[PDB]
Amino acid sequence: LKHFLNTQDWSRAELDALLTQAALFKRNKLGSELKGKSIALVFFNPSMRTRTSFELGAFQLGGHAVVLQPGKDAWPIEFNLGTVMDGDTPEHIAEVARVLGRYVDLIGVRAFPKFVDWSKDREDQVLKSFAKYSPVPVINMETITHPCQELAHALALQEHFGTPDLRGKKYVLTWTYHPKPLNTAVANSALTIATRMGMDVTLLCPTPDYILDERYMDWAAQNVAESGGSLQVSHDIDSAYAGADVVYAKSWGALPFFGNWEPEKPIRDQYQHFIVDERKMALTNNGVFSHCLPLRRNVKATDAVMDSPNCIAIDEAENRLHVQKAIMAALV
Amino acid sequence: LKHFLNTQDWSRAELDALLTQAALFKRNKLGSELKGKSIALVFFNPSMRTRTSFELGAFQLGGHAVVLQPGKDAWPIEFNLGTVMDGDTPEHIAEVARVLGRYVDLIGVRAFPKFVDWSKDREDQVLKSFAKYSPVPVINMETITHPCQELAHALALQEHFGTPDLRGKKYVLTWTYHPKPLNTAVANSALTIATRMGMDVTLLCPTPDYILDERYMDWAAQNVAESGGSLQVSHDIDSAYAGADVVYAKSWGALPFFGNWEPEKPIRDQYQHFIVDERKMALTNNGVFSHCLPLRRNVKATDAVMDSPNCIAIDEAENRLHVQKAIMAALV
Amino acid sequence: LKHFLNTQDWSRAELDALLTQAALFKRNKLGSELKGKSIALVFFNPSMRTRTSFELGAFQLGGHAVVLQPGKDAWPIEFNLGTVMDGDTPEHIAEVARVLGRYVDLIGVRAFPKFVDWSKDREDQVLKSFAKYSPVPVINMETITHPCQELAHALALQEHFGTPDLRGKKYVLTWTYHPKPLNTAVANSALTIATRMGMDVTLLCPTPDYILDERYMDWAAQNVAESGGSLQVSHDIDSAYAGADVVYAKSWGALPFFGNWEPEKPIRDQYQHFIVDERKMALTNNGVFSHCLPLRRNVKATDAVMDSPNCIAIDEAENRLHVQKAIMAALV
Ligand SMILES: CCC[C@H](NC(=O)CCC(=O)O)C(=O)O
Ligand SMILES: CCC[C@H](NC(=O)CCC(=O)O)C(=O)O
Ligand SMILES: CCC[C@H](NC(=O)CCC(=O)O)C(=O)O
């Protein structure tokens, strides 16, 4: 059974088919690719865009989405095997996945890491559990990667440059400030999709500590090697933004500090200047700027940049809807 | 772009068209005025009637409603401008409104005041923010006014008297008891719609402190002046109910006590007799009684009154469904 | 007006019609028995299966389900009569039921007991209040009985044995361990449906204290007397499982300990061996095993049993969907 866990599991031709079909849905939003069909959207963390775009996407295609929130309405779910379940979890993912399998045609899941031990978070236990026990296709709605955002971001870029071939473009994935440490998911996904598109990627971040998990650095290299692009890690703002075509900001907690965020506080606080403002954007090749959102103004990016005509954040958010309808349609 | 923020922004002819179309939907509930269309219902406070009537109204018209609750599922939203967003709000209404604008065709919003400073609450920051940044029509689901209730209430009255012309009817908007201070919204809306219908309106309330904000007292005067009705403030129960045709109860916190409810407690507690019971209703001209609901029995009104055949509360609640389908249909 | 509060209120012919229609829906899931229709699903407790199966069932039949959760989104609801509502409940079920009555065509309700006083819980105040004030058919989504589970369980059994006639089968309803005391609902329902099907029922439980409320023991006797089956209470594991055809596990708090669970703790803890493992299942006549779910692994049943080909828990969960579509279709 084919799932949509990461874009890395898909061939360039399959992904390309997805984007084109997404572009097709954007011109003809109503359809019947999901008539009488339904999808279970399971959320273990908040969401505005993902929840809304999927719920609407399923409706516009003749289907119906059932939104579940383990712990708020549905029963909390246990993921570990061979365990005496006398704790806070009343049922196991093995049952939950098989049960949903008899009701819905697709299962979407959102589960951010717990931030206590990256060794445990990097395993993607939730997504992998669903994909293992579910008799129906599973869709990643963001765990430690955000593949749906990738395709929304990618489509938005091609649309901006009026071409599907983004090779030779200078892509800058910059870390940005935030009072607290966040998920690396969106970053791992951006690095993955930008290198898969074959762009000249620079991972701008404060210190080596902030470099993404090796897994994605490796996926990125394999992508560069295959698409003819390039990868590069920079700790210098100006040399990074210089002549950039795209600038994607996202804040995240330094991996080496999982479970020990105390000393991480004083470190991130001394890099607030990483904020994406006009100065840095002026150094770009009239480049574009985006963010997966939700975005904090005057923290991650200044008001002037968000309101700038060069900001394609709203278009990227919109394509989430089209891109996901292409995925669901392709999975049923 | 035309919105439905308050009935005061609409002409008498437009409002009349709304009520008639609502009466038309009441005879033919299923339609296609919203086929393939959707609406984002954003709730910052609880709701049973509004949430249900809108969700159903959108369905019965071929559309789909997406219910969002900032803080429970969607991300909390910031409304102030030029602020360093390092607080509890992860994203700004400027983005949220533009994003929803790419997904849904209509946006409904519910946001009661915070009760700390009426000077800030009376500004209607949430509703105005949505209407400012949203590329699609916005609908007031209750903030400091409850226009949807107004039209449901109005339709219910015309239906009761078998006529659209309510002029010359004695309308009594009475304050009523409640262990705590509430929103003036429903009251401000009742005063507005009753004076706009050209009835003889009396605002019965305990003391001058309980008189509604000048804004609505002024809207009411302009309405009297235009419809030929009348406005009047009374602190005497019997002289108010006397020969009334309609009696609308609603409890609210004295505006001058926002942020300082301590001394408000002892004041409201000495006016529990304002409860709408049989005695007061007997003094009426066999008048009708209603309440926007949720209503607390034996506090706001006695069981005998609620169960009375003169109580049209349930019909008013029902018309919410028809009246809102007329608004959505008119806005797309 | 006909409701679906308990299977006991329905004749054997009506119930049989329900199961057959459920079997019919299972072959033809999409229909129009609910076109333009809607149902209000009111939840006072968590739910994954019930909420999902009903929401989907309504969709697959052309209708729409509105999920309400008094206290989370909708306003909390008061059920006592002639009370001064100055507490935590803003509105009364008399209004809530009549209001929903003007919006939806059906009302489903879930409300577990409070576990403080069984004398009050056994009254089924919530379900009875809805059925009393609602102008439209009411459906029990589990209170002190779980009739929907009954029919899902029953259908799953007939399907397993390839016949609708379950008479002469040895049915074992066994209590099982759980760190805390639970609702007897599923148990009361199993005892009811198994005796109504005319099987040889044994209620295996630790001590006499754990025997179900007399009401259901009585319903069971009347059912035995009518169907030709049998009822029997056993406190011995091996004599119970011996040659069983069906084994239904469910944990519950000893009724005589409501409001006084302290001493109940040490009592249930000394019966953990009641867990449904392979040994006990080996003593059966190659019997089947099920559980209403959510089920805690290695507490209520071992992993080996849940994963066993003899476990029909997932099928029972699926039939919830078909069985409820048959009920809704029959009630409109
Ligand atoms: C379908 C059964 C629903 C419910 N189950 C629970 O409340 C179990 C909760 C837990 O095990 O923590 C019950 O006991 O009736
Ligand atoms: C689409 C991104 C979702 C999520 N964002 C957050 O958790 C931000 C929360 C905050 O800023 O308070 C993340 O970091 O991946
Ligand atoms: C339709 C009216 C909604 C709201 N009502 C409440 O907040 C009442 C809450 C309570 O009585 O506890 C209000 O006062 O405007």
Task: State the amino acid at position B271 in one-letter form.
Answer: Y
Q: Does the beta-carbon distance from A56 to B64 stay under 8 Å?
A: yes
**E strand or H helix at B128:** helix B125-133
Taking CA atoms, what residue in C is nearest to A104?
C56
Q: Is the minimum distance from the CB of B182 to ligand 3 under 6 angstroms?
A: yes
Place of tokens 């993404």: A212
For residue C38, list chain B residues with Cβ-Cβ distance below 8 A: 56, 59
Residue B219 among known ligand-binding residues: no
Partner-chain residue, chosen from C67, C294, C321, that has the shortest CB–CB distance to A103: C321
Resolution (A): 2.5
Contact indicator for B149, B15 with CB cutoff of 8 Å = no
Neighbours of chain A (3+ CB pairs under 8 A): B, C
CA of C294 to the centre of ligand 1 (A): 6
Closest by CA to B94, choosing from A293, C331, A124, is: A293
Enumerate the β-bridge partners of residue C230.
Answer: C200
HEC-encoded secondary structure of chain A:
CCCECCHHHCCHHHHHHHHHHHHHHHHCCCCCCCCCCEEEEEECCCCCHHHHHHHHHHHHCCCEEEEECCCCCCCCEECCCCCCCCCCCCEEHHHHHHHHHHHCCEEEEECCCCCCCHHHHCCCHHHHHHHHHCCCCEEECCCCCCHHHHHHHHHHHHHHHCCCCCCCCEEEEEECCCCCCCCCHHHHHHHHHHHHCCCEEEEECCCHHHCCCHHHHHHHHHHHHHHCCEEEEECCHHHHHCCCCEEEEECCCCHHHCCCCCCHHHHHHHHHHHCECHHHHHCCCCCEEECCCCCCECCCECHHHHCCCCECHHHHHHHHHHHHHHHHHHHC
CB contact B155 to A (< 8 Å): no
CB contact A78 to C (< 8 Å): yes
Ligand 2 atom, smallest distance to A49 CA: 1
Q: Does the beta-carbon distance from C75 to B30 stay under 8 Å?
A: no
Task: State the amino acid at position A331 in one-letter form.
Answer: L
Contact indicator for C76, C93 with CB cutoff of 8 Å = no
CB contact A195 to B (< 8 Å): no
Buried b (16+ CB within 10 A) or exposed e, B199-233: bbbbbbbbeeebbbbeebbebbeebbeebebbbee
Q: Is the minimum distance from the CB of C183 to ligand 1 under 6 angstroms?
A: yes
Looking from the CA of B84 toward its CB, the CA atoms found within 13 Å total 7
Ligand 1 atom, smallest distance to C47 CA: 3
Q: Which ligand is nearest to the CA of B180?
A: 3
- How many angstroms separate the Cα of C56 from the Cα of each of A159, C50, C51, C122? 37, 10, 9, 31
How far, in Å, CA of A272 to CA of A290, rounded?
A: 18
Residue B218 φ/ψ, nearest 5 degrees: -75, -45
CA dihedral A61, A64, A70, A76 (to 10 degrees): -120
CB contact B318 to C (< 8 Å): yes
CA of A297 to the centre of ligand 2 (A): 14
What separation, in Å, do the N-terminal and C-terminal C-alpha atoms of chain B show?
10
**Which method was it determined by?**
X-ray
How far, in Å, CA of B116 to CA of B120, rounded?
A: 8
How far, in Å, CA of B255 to CA of B183, rounded?
A: 9
Helix (H, G, I), strand (E, B) or coil at B140: strand
Residue C266, Cβ density class (10 Å: 0-12 exposed, 13-18 middle, ≥19 buried): exposed
CB contact B273 to C (< 8 Å): no
CA dihedral C316, C317, C323, C327 (to 10 degrees): 140
* Distant-in-sequence, close-in-space partners of C317: CB < 8 Å, separation ≥ 6: A95, A99, A102, C49, C152, C293
Best to test chain C binding among A103, A106, A109 (most C CBs inside 10 Å): A103
Residue B37 φ/ψ, nearest 5 degrees: -100, 160
Query: Taking CB atoms and a 6 Å cutoff, what residues make up the pocket around ligand 2?
Result: A 182-183, 185-186, 292, 294, 296; B 90
- How many angstroms separate the Cα of B328 from the Cα of each of A283, B148, C130? 47, 11, 31
Closest by CA to C5, choosing from C182, C188, C153, C173, is: C188
Q: Does the beta-carbon distance from A68 to C52 stay under 8 Å?
A: yes
Residue A227 among known ligand-binding residues: no
Best to test chain A binding among B42, B72, B89, B92 (most A CBs inside 10 Å): B92
Ligand 3 atom, smallest distance to B142 CA: 15
For residue C43, list chain A residues with Cβ-Cβ distance below 8 A: 73
Sign for the pseudo-dihedral over CA of C58, C60, C63, C69: positive
What chain B holds in terms of domains, given with CATH numbers, is 1-148+320-332 (3.40.50.1370), 149-319 (3.40.50.1370)
